[PDB]
């Protein structure tokens, strides 16, 4: 009985799980990581996926693809595509009203549909699963945002088929998170569930009604350009200003210095979820000058205060659209890596008058956890 896997094909990070023996195994990749960047890179010599793409020793911005999930299933002329293109370092081209990402690989220009890019991330997730299981995987559940339309769903499925998978079902992210917590097991009688999902790039609030195992999506809200990367960017700008103060040099036009600082800021952020301060130490940041400093949790919170507070507006809106009072939410579920931030948890819990948060499943894994549960259900 060869297991089906569950894949969270994320905007910024993806995750794969498998259900066996009554229990989900979230599968670590070859570097030991339980999540894997949704990044593909092309060089003079190789195609890199995941951690190797995100962590290249040498900047390759034109040929390092990410955010494919923002393109998948959309027409080239979609306002969202045209908007997003302006900020990406890689080129997007029109092929018969469909976007393609164009890069250089082994010295030749070529282009890929978003579903081909995303198939490369799914193949990596498949391979991570296969390395753990010891045999080929042929069946999967793949998740998508609740707001995805038929074309975005179909393109995600087609990314799965490309990758060699039989896609058992495409299921919504917030539904997968609820399944992870066993909330689908409820009997007859409506239960309202709020899923608060703050990831790397996007913020999604969904309100679900579950009644005897049947899910209805009652409301969706959020901000497609609010996520952990924006918090990293506030720390970057802070530290650029601190380096000018101390060294009388502006690092901001040095692409490598900014990248290294951003990576260091992301790591210090994560530390600040469990400690009240973090050390940020980068050798030879700019013109040979070491930058050894630190950041407190309080200061981080100040830097990002408007961003964190803004997460409550979509929560209000979703409650209004679902025609529900706070007290009528039965369960609050945290999804997305950025939900580990203490101040974000505080804001939400305070808004809900002290209500417990369902947070025992690592929030960046919950989607995959549920998709793995559901893939085994569907296999029978
Ligand atoms: N311990 C942590 N504290 C703060 N943020 C974190 C923590 N762990 C992960 N994150 C952040 O979570 C984001 C990724 O969220 P994730 O849910 O894995 O992906 P995606 O949004 O693709 O679904 C990144 O911005 C990352 O820095
Ligand atoms: Mg996510
Ligand atoms: Na993810
Ligand atoms: Na999200």
Residue numbers in the entry: 3 to 382
Give the authors' words.
TEW is the best described member of the POM class of additives that are used to allow phasing and to promote protein crystallization. The TEW molecule has an approximately disk-shaped structure consisting of six edge-sharing WO6 octahedra enclosing an octahedrally arranged tellurium ion. The effect of TEW on the crystallization behavior of proteins has been ascribed to both favorable entropic effects by displacing water molecules from protein surface patches upon binding and the formation of new crystal contacts. Binding of TEW did not induce conformational changes of HSP70 in either crystal form.
In crystal form 1, the asymmetric unit contains a single molecule each of TEW and HSP70 NBD. The crystal packing is identical to that of the crystals that were obtained in the absence of TEW. As observed in the absence of TEW, ADP is bound deeply in the ATP binding pocket. TEW is bound with an occupancy of 0.6 next to Asn355. Terminal oxygen atoms of TEW form hydrogen bond interactions with the side chain nitrogen of Asn355 (2.7 Å) and the backbone nitrogen of Ala329 (2.7 Å). TEW lies at a crystal contact and interacts with the neighboring HSP70 molecule: a bridging O of TEW forms a water mediated interaction with the side chain of Ser276 (2.6 Å) and a terminal O of TEW forms a hydrogen bond with the amino group of the bound ADP (3.1 Å). Additional electron density around TEW suggests some disorder of this molecule in the structure. Additional water mediated hydrogen bond interactions may exist between TEW and the Asn355 side chain as well as the backbone carbonyl of Arg272 of a symmetry related monomer. As TEW is known to allow SAD phasing of novel protein structures, the structure of HSP70 was also solved by SAD phasing applying the same dataset which was used for molecular replacement of crystal form 1. Despite the presence of ice rings, the single bound TEW molecule was located and used for initial phasing.
